[PDB]
Design a protein around this ligand. Sequence first.
Ligand code: GSH
Ligand code: GSH
Lengths: 221, 221
Amino acid sequence: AEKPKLHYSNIRGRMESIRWLLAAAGVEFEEKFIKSAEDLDKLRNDGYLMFQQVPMVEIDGMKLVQTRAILNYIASKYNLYGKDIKEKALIDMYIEGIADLGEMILLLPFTQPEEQDAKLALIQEKTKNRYFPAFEKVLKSHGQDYLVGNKLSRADIHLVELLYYVEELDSSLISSFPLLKALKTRISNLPTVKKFLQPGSPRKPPMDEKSLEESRKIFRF
Amino acid sequence: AEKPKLHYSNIRGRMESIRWLLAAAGVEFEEKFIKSAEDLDKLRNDGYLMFQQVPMVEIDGMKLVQTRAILNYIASKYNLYGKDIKEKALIDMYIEGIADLGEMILLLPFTQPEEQDAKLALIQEKTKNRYFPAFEKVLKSHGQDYLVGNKLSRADIHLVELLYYVEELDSSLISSFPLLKALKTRISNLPTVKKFLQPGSPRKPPMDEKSLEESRKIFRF
Ligand SMILES: N[C@H](CCC(=O)N[C@@H](CS)C(=O)NCC(=O)O)C(=O)O
Ligand SMILES: N[C@H](CCC(=O)N[C@@H](CS)C(=O)NCC(=O)O)C(=O)O
């Protein structure tokens, strides 16, 4: 059948956790790279973009926009969203805290070149003091190998993704959290993630000066 | 069972959309109002807040934090989140757009009178040209009384909520949208919303100097 088609530019940005979750669920996908402002304009005028924004994913006859609409849908389809609504609640709660810290990190490279050192320090503070202890606490509390339901879920996917970007920004920040390192190893050892982690996968690099200016032209900022 | 218990200060804030949804869905609740920074530290010390922040709702034996976790749980519990995974995706798509316009609106009063001229003009332009057309379009396509599935969903609730704040800010923005206007009248006349709209209800007023000063000292930002 059809592969989901991801509409975005050749960067991490808001499309990345979508890629991770599809690739962790072993789903093959295609990408159609926006290279210019005209490419996005073309999407807007064809009426493919409900709020005239990307990410957009074509999946199952649907033109889906809004990172959460898409992630949610994908998580459900491939059974990574828990077994019942009480499990979704814990899952939603965990990932929305992961999204909060992940939003900080995503916006960091788009910060003013001097504003960045202060912005990082807040990321170093919220990671060490707030989010990492929250997730280490959940693991220690139930003694289990995954975040919710004693079973792999999207919550496991999203968190380890974050651990990889934290490692990039400050390798020391995970050092006192051995249940998160252990989760990072277990999840990373999974056939689909391991493969997505290897070279040549559709996993994307950090922002550089090239793609940062690419993005300013394309989205108009 | 015990009434859902709501932990916040006496403001609209990130809790107000929870207040609307619970009210639209016929659910009586209790609100434990945070009145100081010391009230917030207590919840933090008692280990009540996973990420040391509110909104927090106590419901069904959980201490739920993160507006979207809370909201999503209530929607599903009360059958306002669609009949299946495909309809969830339409609703998710809509309410994330509604939440983006709402978030601009939410931050405006905390933004100082310097940028208030700039931040309000953006709400105005995006309301008129992006969001309002998107939802008018949806209502136009099926001619039905409700957004998704010819039946009250949480999208109708978050939208009509939104149409009340947009009316506060600029009563003219809806004026060229006959179907949004008529949606507002019908959701406002449903017994439970009509009751929530009545004097004396848990519905909260806009920000003012006093509430803003209180918010500064409670949340220390
Ligand atoms: N609500 C956001 C929309 C994403 C967004 O900020 N869109 C950007 C791409 S990173 C865009 O297409 N910008 C053009 C615009 O907003 O005018 C989401 O959760 O995905
Ligand atoms: N991720 C948001 C968190 C809301 C938030 O920014 N919380 C603020 C006030 S509404 C707070 O409790 N401030 C204390 C702090 O974060 O340090 C949610 O939906 O719950």
